[PDB]
Design a protein around this ligand. Structure first.
Ligand SMILES: OC[C@H]1O[C@@H](O)[C@H](O)[C@@H](O)[C@@H]1O
Ligand SMILES: OC[C@H]1O[C@@H](O)[C@H](O)[C@@H](O)[C@@H]1O
Ligand code: NA
Lengths: 339, 346
């Protein structure tokens, strides 16, 4: 079933319940996932109204872009020309700059295909918005099926050469409660390398590092506590995890990561080359989710995209988007329950 | 009473009924007026869903900006600096550029004050959007009261020195049917001068002209047919009216314009210095409104703003907006019955 309701400030809440009784809901405010629940438990972090997102934290579950992550000094080179983007975190451009696409109300259309339902959100980023050349017509389609697969498919076209590398900012928490650390979840991740950060500004250090046999090697399922109690300087630097992991094998058919807690597991699939993992290292902040005070490590993201820092480490990839080319990306979160 | 429902594509339709039973409705897609009825008759033009606006004509009833009208070659000078804005009408920047504010979903909040209900729409124009320095935090408040007054109040603040001069693009048609020309309406307008256009591209000519005693003189009420039938070069140029009228006396307290049909009148009040009037000179385009094919002259706007062309005719005004300074504008459309005797035939 599909249900549409007012979510506040003019935004809508679109809730989809599949044949299995699983419920997933989205809002056009930022083409974002709001909730995902099974047997009355939430699997992800989310708020109860639009206002909350705007007052508390606008990132959770949102589509961020045009470029996800931090860009040093807000500087990009397009066709050999330097362009300065909106700087909203010190001199860096973080997640597209201030008041980006995650704070806008996107238009949308729902398409019911029976076993699958799609919600297609659309937005035009005007030429010059936050310094980005355009216009860029973007659409993000969130879909949910009877096999419990939540899929995100992005598409974009720009009238001018530009940059584009959006991501989905959902935070998972299989405890179903933000006041409980994800340290107890098990994580498996098909990455042998990572991108270290320079310092507390979170810009990239400049190199690529092999993590085989370190506290960050999750090639074999392991509990998060491990990484959390690690003394690796990188872990210590951010107080948890806040890094881009380079996937070993690219392709949508491969399960790139898996997050497990008891009989409940989440598998991640993507056509992107990297996954940025951030473990809600908020310390004492105590953001309130569903009246529950959030704890440090009270959530974890799987931001699939081209690794941030390619401006400094070209090997990472290239996020350019030439005028007229059609950008496409796909990320899938599959829910499984052991029997 | 206040009512809200989905209007399509994620937009909402907010419908207000005052104590006198007059209903008016708006949508957050473009902070726009959708309909205004009295006794079951449409007083303005509008569509029945959001998609129509996007597919047929996105301007009707919209809030347009950041700058309303045409800016020659999309060039403005801001604090000694030249800025080129998005050019979407040939080399001109028309109503803020392509995919402007009228095409976005604004957030909103409704405030019920009893005899008056306010709908405040908000939106941020990011810095550099369509070439405009910002960011610009905008808000448009549409309100309706028990006195049949529809008021539009604009507010804005910019992080940077920029330009700002938005307007409301409502189209009136007292016939309540787009297929009926407004040549049968009576018009009174407190303006002695107008701004002629250079040519078909519709940029300003460079001069201000006195219209007293011409077919464009509506200081004293006259039927619109008078203008429509005129062979004045300017009328012929645009096939009707499509010009800025300079108000003779400024001030929100003065009735600047009045449009009448039989027992119904609409009075226009504003704090702006001019009114751009466009009479739907679409020829045989025949856009469908409520399944009625719109006729040439099947509608009229009263866009209250600083006249377009100030880039060329400084006398017209200054639309610049200094960083941190608060912009405000107020325009009011008021509805009356039996305000005067208007009994004609066409
Ligand atoms: O991705 C968004 C997040 O990035 C992290 O690295 C920061 O520490 C968070 O405060 C921020 O909300
Ligand atoms: O105000 C916008 C309008 O400008 C007029 O001068 C044009 O002829 C119309 O096509 C357009 O919708
Ligand atoms: Na809605």
């Amino acid at each position: 079933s599909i249900k549409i309701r007012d979510f506040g400030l003019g935004s809508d809440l679109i809730s989809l319940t599949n044949k299995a009784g699983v419920t997933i809901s989205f809002t056009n405010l930022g083409a974002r996932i709001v909730d995902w629940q099974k047997d009355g438990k939430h699997l992800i972090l989310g708020f109860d109204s639009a206002k909350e997102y705007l007052e508390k934290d606008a990132y959770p579950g949102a589509t961020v872009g045009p470029t996800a992550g931090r860009i040093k000094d807000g500087l990009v080179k397009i066709s050999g020309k330097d362009y300065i983007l909106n700087q909203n975190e010190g001199p860096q451009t973080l997640h597209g700059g201030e008041e980006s696409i995650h704070t806008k109300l996107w238009t949308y259309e729902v398409t019911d295909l029976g076993a699958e339902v799609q919600v297609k959100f659309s937005l035009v980023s005007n030429d010059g918005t936050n310094g980005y050349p355009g216009k860029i017509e973007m659409s993000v389609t969130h879909s949910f099926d009877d096999d419990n697969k939540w899929k995100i498919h992005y598409e974009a076209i720009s009238d001018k050469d530009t940059v584009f590398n959006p991501t989905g900012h959902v935070y998972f928490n299989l405890n179903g409660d933000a006041s409980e650390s994800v340290e107890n979840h098990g994580l498996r991740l098909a990455a042998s390398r990572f991108v270290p950060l320079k310092d507390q500004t979170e810009i990239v250090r400049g190199d690529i590092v092999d993590i085989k046999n370190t506290d960050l090697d999750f090639r074999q399922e392991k509990q998060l506590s491990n990484a959390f109690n690690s003394n690796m300087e990188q872990v210590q630097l951010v107080k948890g995890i806040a890094h881009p992991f380079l996937l070993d094998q690219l392709g949508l058919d491969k399960e790139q990561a898996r997050l497990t807690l008891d009989d409940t597991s989440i598998s991640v699939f993507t056509d992107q080359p990297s996954i940025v993992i951030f473990t809600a290292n908020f310390g004492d902040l105590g953001t309130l989710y569903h009246e529950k005070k959030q704890v440090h490590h009270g959530g974890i993201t799987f931001e699939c995209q081209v690794s941030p820092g390619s401006e400094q480490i070209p090997e990472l990839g290239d996020i350019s988007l030439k005028a007229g080319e059609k950008y496409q990306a796909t990320t899938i979160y599959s829910l499984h329950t052991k029997l």
